[PDB]
């Protein structure tokens, strides 16, 4: 029979229909698009369109496999044995490594001897449960995908608007009058997005692609502007100057809804590429030097006439005056002609009745000033009145299907679910933890994070419902206050692993043997583990690192457990897409062979650990024994429905809150009704409202829209988005102080007959009574962003090291708050990127013959100019080499790549796909991460995979 | 009967269509290698009824004209393939009068496959070296009879692929041509009066493929 699902690949979130033999009990026989889904309307890219081949695949794992120390083979074992043995490894390693107090005598209750990677590929209920299992075990080294592509940039949106998320959503692109795609190859990497992009074009939108390469995206845009690697901030700074010089900013929006009018204190300055407060010894700023001038109430002073010399807007004008078209054209390599054309077309959206949107994904924002790149986009959007509006926004495109959700559920070392921070060792009590929230004295500033105590208490009640929150607070592990936060993150986990500091690793739904930069180093590091648990669909380069190229299994002592999980269409649960749409999906076919859903694997593993503790005792058993997993279980299995209900939350006593009376056991209708006093639980405050007494709102397949909703495609009854179904964030900025839309033809909200109609208003209150950015301490869209480590305004610092010696904007060449060799044997700028047909490391898509058929081998894209230099012809076999490794690829010689002129010298770019690996297929090639450095970023602690030095030579 | 209108001015070369054809028919994958192109399979074959052809054309200044051609049987109104097969065996090639589909049956194994391929002005038919059966795009004739879009049409995210009754599709082709011709002055329709798969090309069709038009 017929069931609905949601694609397991990218964060567009396309709907599927799955047909299963034997009335829904047997194998899948067909998987195609859901014609009723509002995002894809039945369309699928080749990845979604081949899900049938992913699931009904005789190369999938069938049962658990064990690799003994020094063995060259797998042994098939039972689940009961594999999970008992893993439980025993976990308990031994935890018992041996558990630290109640750190060296300073502070309570930390952690194990630093186990790390976990993964995963954005798991369901939201699975991600939430997984984090809680790992933290109940005392883990702090908990990371996944989001660190690599999203963490380097999301603080830019939090600084600018108050939240880290994509501001609008996919369907909303169709309302744009100008779409700037920059640091994104959306036609290949978010393909169904082009349904809505091309619909904007149909209605007269200009489509602009700013990219070092001409791609399948570029082919369908009106304007293609080449940019040299790392020259984004110059490009965007020039657009800011253009907007200010030509008076194209939306005055009333800027005056009312941005911090343009705020007065910056006298200690702020910038000279010679350095802001005030620079500590040259420790290479950091004293950001207190960037404070606003506060009034007698502690509130920033304001000059709504925008005349005071220290008004944010006047400081901004002065800052960006250097970014003239000649200097910007010279560093970007974009002709002055093309820059003007792009600036004119984009800046035209400053009109109230026009909207422009910016789409970026990963691009090259990995480096130390990627945050400032995105800051610049946020600032351009605030100057043009494009934040909060239909067809506007900063559309930060999420990568994996559920990376939004995996981040939401705290699978990163610095956060619990719902972006509550992991406590540090000096947060000795729950009261100390809660002491840390900044307050506003501005009656118009909502400053919503003041509610955090309710969310932390309700989280502790979800995990430990029979314990008082202050007591349960002592069950969860803490990081050291004294340590750099990046010490707990992705890159340093690999570094620690290579120094032998981990006994165990969970590679849960990731393939770090191909996905991590400098694969040679990481593959050898994995041999320093005592034990590795890999949970995945297929045997892979990680599960089997011990028989990889140049490895001798007889010399590697690591025990490996491979646990085969089931594909998306074989399980139930939710995934949160890029627009925060939390979409429910159903089981079609039964799990293949003896594969299991992640939730079943982790819950059974944890229950066996709990049994071992009950039988034997061990280190600090309370967090393990008292964890509430009974709320997670139905039919002796993991229950997506029950976990989703707990993540929403329910009342643990009769409660009066928000002027309403609730009964013990009722679902919490929204996070507005959470309490700090133990009356409520909620696994994730962002989920409070997703699963109410009305039922599972994530499972709504209702295209009901009012005329106002339909005109812009909000689809408010199709699934549910956080927060509380606000489809367009910051939507109070889309109206004037009387609540009338700037653009009535594309209204997001409007005040009619005493209520907001359209979207759910982002912040309750009558028109003109509240600042539109309710998550900001001060309530404004931040043009000046004094929380950023590199400064309150973006400034060009060269992210390239090897080909640049001079910065034309200042005497500071590189980021002043951030050891590339630049060996002249590797003269070309290597870069890695995706194609439409493959997924991530290709672990999944290299198993799908139809995708291999289209893109069977690693290739190397080069210009005719580089081919000429090296004697390469199209289709030649080439060796691509770096200081870290070497691989062979097929040459693709194409005019889609052109040389950069950098300081009077042609510098060539070499393009590689990172989708290949030694396991499969035959003659596919190995990972481009053999080539990439692991050196990592001082600021972001984020790897370099978009510009790294290589050679390419004919074989 | 029915017609496809294929607006190549909207194609992102996602190859959803190429994959969706194989998923729906459960066709085998070919052994392929990269020989200096994204294009693969390089050609139609007995097991590949659609492939996306990729052509780069130089343009002065930044970027190229990147031409994408998702090739399939044109379902000719008076099909030459059928004229040739019928000489050997009626029933090898038949016309479905409901949809306009030109359909190859198992009896193609008993006709001169080489001659049938040569008769096709679009060089579409392909022979199985083992069974000698001919294959090509069947218009997803069985989905269409059952009120569904062809697999490659439903999957297309861009509006490139369109399908419907011939009157509706010719009206859309005429209207869309006028609109696209604004941006692409060399835009034309492929043999719109002879075939049921009507391509809008953005320039000389023969730049997309040597057999793009008759
Ligand atoms: N088909 C497919 N889709 C995917 C994935 C996949 O593997 N395959 N992965 C998913 C994931 S996890 C993620 S995070 C996203 C990432 O999605 P994208 O960020 O779109 O991915 P890339 O293709 O790596 O890079 C985008 C573009 O950045 C350009 N670029 C490189 N350097 C610069 C620079 O200095 N400036 C500018 N402006 N552009 C630059 C590259 O030329 C490339 O075209 O994609 C997701 N979608
Ligand atoms: N050089 C270079 N390196 C890169 C990148 C780049 O652009 N260049 N991109 C980076 C980025 S943005 C990312 S996000 C990472 C991705 O790195 P990884 O996440 O390690 O990559 P994959 O493992 O290929 O990602 C898909 C995984 O999800 C698994 N999977 C799918 N469904 C399930 C399920 O239900 N459960 C479980 N347990 N597993 C499941 C698949 O089997 C597969 O292992 O790579 C990073 N690495
Ligand atoms: S990979 Fe992304 S665009 Fe393609 S079908 Fe899946 S969700 Fe849709
Ligand atoms: S395109 Fe060729 S194979 Fe198809 S109907 Fe016409 S003559 Fe026959
Ligand atoms: S109409 Fe059907 S058979 Fe023909 S190319 Fe499309 S999917 Fe394949
Ligand atoms: S699915 Fe549509 S956009 Fe994608 S290659 Fe086929 S015709 Fe072009
Ligand atoms: Cl079956
Ligand atoms: Cl054993
Ligand atoms: Cl329990
Ligand atoms: Cl409906
Ligand atoms: Cl390195
Ligand atoms: S991701
Ligand atoms: W990613």
Q: Say if CB A171 and CB A350 are below 8 A apart.
A: no
* Vertex B63 angle, CA A832 and A354, to 5°: 95
Q: Say if CB A183 and CB A232 are below 8 A apart.
A: yes
Residues of A in contact with B56 (CB under 8 A): 894-896
Q: CB of A844 within 8 Å of any CB in chain B?
A: no
Q: How far is the CA of A511 from the centre of ligand 2 (A)?
A: 6
Q: CB of A48 within 8 Å of any CB in chain B?
A: yes
3-class state of residue A232 by DSSP: helix
- Of A212, A695, A132, A225, the C-alpha closest to A416 is A132
- What is the spatial distance between Cα A695 and Cα A450, in angstroms, rounded to a whole number? 29
3-class state of residue B65 by DSSP: strand
Count of A-B CB contacts under 8 Å? 159
CA A655 to chain centre: 36
A221 is in an annotated binding site: no
3-class state of residue A142 by DSSP: strand
CA A638 to chain centre: 26
Whether ligand 6 lies within 6 angstroms of the CB of B38 is answered as no
User: Concatenated DSSP letters for A184-204?
Assistant: --HHHHSTTHHHHHHHHHHTT
- Of A171, A235, A487, the C-alpha closest to A364 is A235
Residues of B in contact with A43 (CB under 8 A): 16, 154-157
Task: Give the count of alpha carbons within 13 A of A732, CB side only.
Answer: 26
- What is the spatial distance between Cα B49 and Cα B136, in angstroms, rounded to a whole number? 5
Q: CB of A628 within 8 Å of any CB in chain B?
A: no
Question: What letter does residue A299 receive in the DSSP assignment?
Answer: P
Structure tokens at A130: 């997984």
Contacts of residue B192, defined as CB under 8 A and 6 or more positions apart, other chains included, come to: B170, B173, B198
Residues of B in contact with A850 (CB under 8 A): 19, 22-23, 29
- What is the spatial distance between Cα A160 and Cα A155, in angstroms, rounded to a whole number? 8
- Of A71, A339, A254, A257, the C-alpha closest to A772 is A257
**Which residue positions of B form the known binding site for [4Fe-4S] cluster?**
11, 14, 17, 21, 73, 76, 81, 120, 137, 140, 152, 156
Nearest to A33 among B15, B62, B155 (CB): B155
Where would I find the H helices in A117-216? 124-136, 146-149, 154-161, 186-189, 193-202
CA B103 to chain centre: 14
Q: How many CB atoms lie within 10 A of CB A252?
A: 12
Where would I find the H helices in A484-630? 490-498, 512-515, 519-526, 598-616, 622-625
Report residue A229: phi and psi, to 5°.
-45, 125
CB contact under 8 A, B19 and A46: yes
- What is the spatial distance between Cα A608 and Cα A729, in angstroms, rounded to a whole number? 43
A10 is in an annotated binding site: yes
* Vertex A358 angle, CA A948 and B162, to 5°: 100
- Of B47, B115, B38, the C-alpha closest to B84 is B115
Nearest to A49 among B12, B23, B61 (CB): B23
- What is the spatial distance between Cα A14 and Cα A39, in angstroms, rounded to a whole number? 6
* Vertex A837 angle, CA A834 and A842, to 5°: 70
- What is the spatial distance between Cα A15 and Cα A39, in angstroms, rounded to a whole number? 8
- What is the spatial distance between Cα A37 and Cα A6, in angstroms, rounded to a whole number? 10
3-state secondary structure A925-942: CCCHHHCCCCCCCCCCCC
Structure tokens at A408: 């939401």
Nearest to A195 among B29, B40, B157 (CB): B157
Choose which residue among A34, A47, A189 to substitute to test ligand 3 binding: the one with the highest number of ligand atoms within 8 A of its C-beta.
A47
CB contact under 8 A, B32 and A849: no
Residue A833, Ramachandran bin (φ over 0: left; ψ between -120 and 50: alpha; else beta): beta
Where would I find the H helices in A499-595? 512-515, 519-526
The breaks in chain A (C to N more than 2.5 Å) occur after: 818
- Of A518, A153, A198, A161, the C-alpha closest to A363 is A153
CA–CA min distance A38, chain B (Å): 12
Name the residue at shortest CA distance from atom 1 of ligand 12: A399
Q: Please state how this structure was obtained.
A: X-ray
Residues of A in contact with B37 (CB under 8 A): 874-875, 892
Structure tokens at A494: 């690999």
Q: CB of A50 within 8 Å of any CB in chain B?
A: yes
- What is the spatial distance between Cα A30 and Cα A33, in angstroms, rounded to a whole number? 10
- What is the spatial distance between Cα B45 and Cα B134, in angstroms, rounded to a whole number? 9
Report residue A319: phi and psi, to 5°.
-65, -40
CA–CA min distance A221, chain B (Å): 10
Please give the residue range of the domain that contains residue B136: 80-142
3-class state of residue A867 by DSSP: helix
Question: What letter does residue A905 receive in the DSSP assignment?
Answer: E
Mutation site for B-interface testing, chosen from A12, A336, A854, A921 by largest number of B Cβ within 10 Å: A854
CB contact under 8 A, A49 and B20: yes
- Of B59, B120, B129, the C-alpha closest to B85 is B120
Sign (positive or negative) of CA dihedral A703, A708, A713, A717 = negative
Whether ligand 3 lies within 6 angstroms of the CB of A7 is answered as yes
Question: Cα torsion for A211, A213, A219, A222, to the nearest 10°?
Answer: 30
* Vertex A6 angle, CA A3 and A12, to 5°: 155
Full strand arrangement of the beta sheet holding A720-721: A573-576, A581-585, A720-721
- Give the domain CATH number at B134: 3.30.70.20
Task: Parse chain A into domains and list their residue ranges.
Answer: 1-59+260-311+402-479+634-726, 60-147+480-633, 148-259+312-401+727-786, 787-955
The string over A306-329, giving b where at least 16 C-beta atoms fall within 10 Å of a residue's C-beta and e elsewhere, is: bebebbbbbbbeebbebbbbebbb
Contacts of residue A203, defined as CB under 8 A and 6 or more positions apart, other chains included, come to: A174
Question: Where does residue A91 rank: exposed (0-12), middle (13-18), buried (19+ CB within 10 A)?
Answer: buried
- What is the spatial distance between Cα B36 and Cα A877, in angstroms, rounded to a whole number? 9
Between positions 241 and 280 of A, the ones with CB within 8 A of B are none
Q: Say if CB A543 and CB A510 are below 8 A apart.
A: no
The string over B159-183, giving b where at least 16 C-beta atoms fall within 10 Å of a residue's C-beta and e elsewhere, is: bbbbbbeeeebbebbeebbeebeee
User: Concatenated DSSP letters for B96-119?
Assistant: -TTT--EEE-GGGGGS-HHHHHHH
Nearest ligand, CA of residue B10? 6
Q: How many CB atoms lie within 10 A of CB A291?
A: 14
Strand partners, A308: none
Nearest CA in chain B to A36: B154
Q: Say if CB B62 and CB A214 are below 8 A apart.
A: yes
Pairing relationship of beta strands B51-58 and B64-71 according to DSSP bridges:
antiparallel
Q: Which residues surround ligand 10, an ion (CB under 5 A)?
A: A 703
Between positions 327 and 386 of A, the ones with CB within 8 A of B are 335, 338
A822 is in an annotated binding site: no
Resolution in units of Å: 1.6
Strand partners, A422: none
3-state secondary structure A755-789: EEEECCCCCCCCCCCCCCCCCCCCCCECCCCCCCC
Structure tokens at A439: 């307050």
CA–CA min distance B90, chain A (Å): 33
- What is the spatial distance between Cα B56 and Cα B63, in angstroms, rounded to a whole number? 10
Between positions 910 and 929 of A, the ones with CB within 8 A of B are 923
Contacts of residue A15, defined as CB under 8 A and 6 or more positions apart, other chains included, come to: A4, A5, A6, A7, A33, A34, A36, A37, A39, A40, A583
CB contact under 8 A, A43 and B18: no
């Amino acid at each position: 029979k017929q069931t609905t699902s949601i694609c397991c690949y990218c964060a567009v979130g396309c709907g599927l229909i799955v047909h299963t033999a034997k009335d829904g009990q047997g194998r899948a026989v067909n998987v195609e698009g859901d014609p009723d889904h509002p995002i894809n309307e039945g369309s699928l890219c080749p990845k979604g369109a081949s899900i049938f081949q992913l699931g009904e695949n005789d190369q999938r794992g069938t049962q658990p496999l064990y690799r003994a120390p020094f063995s060259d083979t797998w042994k098939p074992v039972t689940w009961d044995f594999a999970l008992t043995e893993i439980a025993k490894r976990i308990k031994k390693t935890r018992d041996a490594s558990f630290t109640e107090k750190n060296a300073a005598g502070d309570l930390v209750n952690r194990t630093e001897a186990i790390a976990s990677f993964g995963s954005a590929a798991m369901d939201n209920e699975e991600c939430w449960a997984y984090g809680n299992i790992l933290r109940s075990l005392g883990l702090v080294y908990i990371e996944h995908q989001a660190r690599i592509x999203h963490s380097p940039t999301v603080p830019a949106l939090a600084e600018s608007f108050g939240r880290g998320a994509m501001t609008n959503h996919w369907n909303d692109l169709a309302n744009s009058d100008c779409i700037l795609i920059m640091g994104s190859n959306a036609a290949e990497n978010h393909p169904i997005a082009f349904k809505w992009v091309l619909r904007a074009k149909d209605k007269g939108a200009t489509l602009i692609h700013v990219d070092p390469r001409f791609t399948r995206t570029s082919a369908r845009c009106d304007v293609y502007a080449p940019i040299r690697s790392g020259a984004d901030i110059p490009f965007l700074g020039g657009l800011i100057k253009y907007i200010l010089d030509n008076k194209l900013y939306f005055t009333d929006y800027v005056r009312e809804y941005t911090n343009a009018s705020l007065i910056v204190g006298e200690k702020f300055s910038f000279k010679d590429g350095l802001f005030s407060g620079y500590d040259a010894a420790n290479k950091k700023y004293d950001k207190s030097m960037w404070a606003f001038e506060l009034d007698a109430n502690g509130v920033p002073k304001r000059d709504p006439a925008l005349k005071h010399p220290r008004c944010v807007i006047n400081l901004l004008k002065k800052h960006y005056e250097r970014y003239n078209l000649d200097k910007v054209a010279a560093i970007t390599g974009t002709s002055k002609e093309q820059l003007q054309q792009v600036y004119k077309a984009y800046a035209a959206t400053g009109k109230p009745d026009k909207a422009g949107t910016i789409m970026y994904a990963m691009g090259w924002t990995q480096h130390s000033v990627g945050v400032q790149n995105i800051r610049a986009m946020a600032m351009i959007q605030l100057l043009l009145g494009n934040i909060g509006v239909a067809g506007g926004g900063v559309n930060a495109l999420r990568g994996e299907s559920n990376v939004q959700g995996s981040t939401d559920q705290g699978l990163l070392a610095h956060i619990w679910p719902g972006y509550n921070p992991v406590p540090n060792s000096k947060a000795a009590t729950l009261e100390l933890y809660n002491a840390a929230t900044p307050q506003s004295k501005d009656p118009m500033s909502v400053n919503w994070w003041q509610n955090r105590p309710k969310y932390v208490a309700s989280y502790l009640k979800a995990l430990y419902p029979d314990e008082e929150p202050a007591a349960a607070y002592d069950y969860l592990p803490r990081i050291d206050a004294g340590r750099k936060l990046t010490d707990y993150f992705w890159l340093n986990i690999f570094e620690k692993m290579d120094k032998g500091e981990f006994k165990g690793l969970f590679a849960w739904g990731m393939n770090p043997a191909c996905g991590g930069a400098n694969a040679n180093k990481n593959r050898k590091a994995m041999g320093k583990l005592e034990w590795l648990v890999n949970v995945n669909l297929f045997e892979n380069e990680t599960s089997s690192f011990w028989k990889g190229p140049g490895m001798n299994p007889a010399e590697i002592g690591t025990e490996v457990f491979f646990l085969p999980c089931c594909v998306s269409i074989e399980k139930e649960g939710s995934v949160a897409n890029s627009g925060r749409w939390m979409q429910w999906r159903y089981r079609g076919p039964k799990p293949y062979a003896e594969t299991k859903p992640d939730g079943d694997i982790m819950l059974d593993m944890f229950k066996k650990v709990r049994e071992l503790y009950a039988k034997e005792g061990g280190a600090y058993p309370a967090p393990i024994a008292k964890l509430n997993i009974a709320d997670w279980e139905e039919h002796n299995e993991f229950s997506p429905t029950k976990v989703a209900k707990l993540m929403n939350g329910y009342f643990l006593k009769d409660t009066e809150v928000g002027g309403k009376q609730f009964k013990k056991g009722q679902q919490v209708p929204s996070f507005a009704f959470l309490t700090a006093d133990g009356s409520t639980c909620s696994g994730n405050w962002l989920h409070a409202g997703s699963f109410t007494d009305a039922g599972n709102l994530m499972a709504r397949r209702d295209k009901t829209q009012t005329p106002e909703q339909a005109r812009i495609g909000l689809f408010p009854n199709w699934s549910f988005c956080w927060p509380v179904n606000r489809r367009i964030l910051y939507n109070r900025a889309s109206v004037d102080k009387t609540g009338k839309p700037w653009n009535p033809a594309k209204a997001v909200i409007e005040w009619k007959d005493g209520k907001w109609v359209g979207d759910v208003v982002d912040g309750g209150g009558d028109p003109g009574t509240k600042h539109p950015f309710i998550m900001q301490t001060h309530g404004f869209g931040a043009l000046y962003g004094p929380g950023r480590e590199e400064g309150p305004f973006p400034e060009h610092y060269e992210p390239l090291e090897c080909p640049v010696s001079k910065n034309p904007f200042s005497k500071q060449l590189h980021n002043p708050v951030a050891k590339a060799v630049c060996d002249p044997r590797y003269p070309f700028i290597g870069t890695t990127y995706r194609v439409t047909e493959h997924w991530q490391t290709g672990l999944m898509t290299r198993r799908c013959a139809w995708l291999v058929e289209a893109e069977p081998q690693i290739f190397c894209e080069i210009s005719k100019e580089l081919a000429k230099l090296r004697g390469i012809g199209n289709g030649d076999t080439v060796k691509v080499s770096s200081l870290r490794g070497a691989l062979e690829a097929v040459a693709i010689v194409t005019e889609r790549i052109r040389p950069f002129k950098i300081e009077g010298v042609d510098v060539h770019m070499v393009g590689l796909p990172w989708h290949y690996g030694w396991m499969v297929p035959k003659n596919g090639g190995d990972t481009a991460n053999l080539l990439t450095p692991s050196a990592g970023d001082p600021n972001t602690g984020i790897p370099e995979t978009k510009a790294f030095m290589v050679d390419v030579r004919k074989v | 009967g029915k017609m496809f209108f294929v607006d190549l001015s909207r194609c992102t070369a996602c190859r959803g269509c190429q994959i969706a054809c194989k998923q729906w028919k459960n066709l085998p994958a070919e052994e392929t290698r990269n020989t200096g192109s994204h294009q693969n399979p390089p050609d139609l074959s007995y097991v590949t009824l659609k492939t996306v052809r990729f052509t780069e054309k130089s343009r002065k200044g930044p970027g190229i004209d990147w031409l994408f051609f998702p090739e399939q049987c044109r379902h000719c109104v008076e099909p030459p393939c059928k004229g040739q097969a019928d000489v050997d065996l009626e029933g090898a090639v038949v016309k479905d009068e409901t949809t306009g589909a030109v359909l190859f049956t198992e009896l193609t194994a008993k006709v001169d496959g080489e001659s049938v391929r040569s008769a096709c002005p679009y060089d579409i038919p392909r022979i199985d070296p083992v069974t000698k059966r001919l294959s090509k795009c069947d218009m997803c004739n069985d989905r269409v009879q059952n009120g569904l879009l062809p697999a490659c049409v439903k999957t297309c995210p861009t509006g490139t692929m369109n399908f419907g009754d011939e009157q509706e599709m010719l009206a859309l082709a005429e209207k869309r041509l006028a609109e696209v011709k604004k941006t692409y002055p060399g835009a034309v329709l492929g043999d719109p009066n002879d075939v049921r798969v009507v391509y809008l090309f953005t320039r000389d069709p023969k730049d997309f493929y040597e057999h793009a038009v008759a």
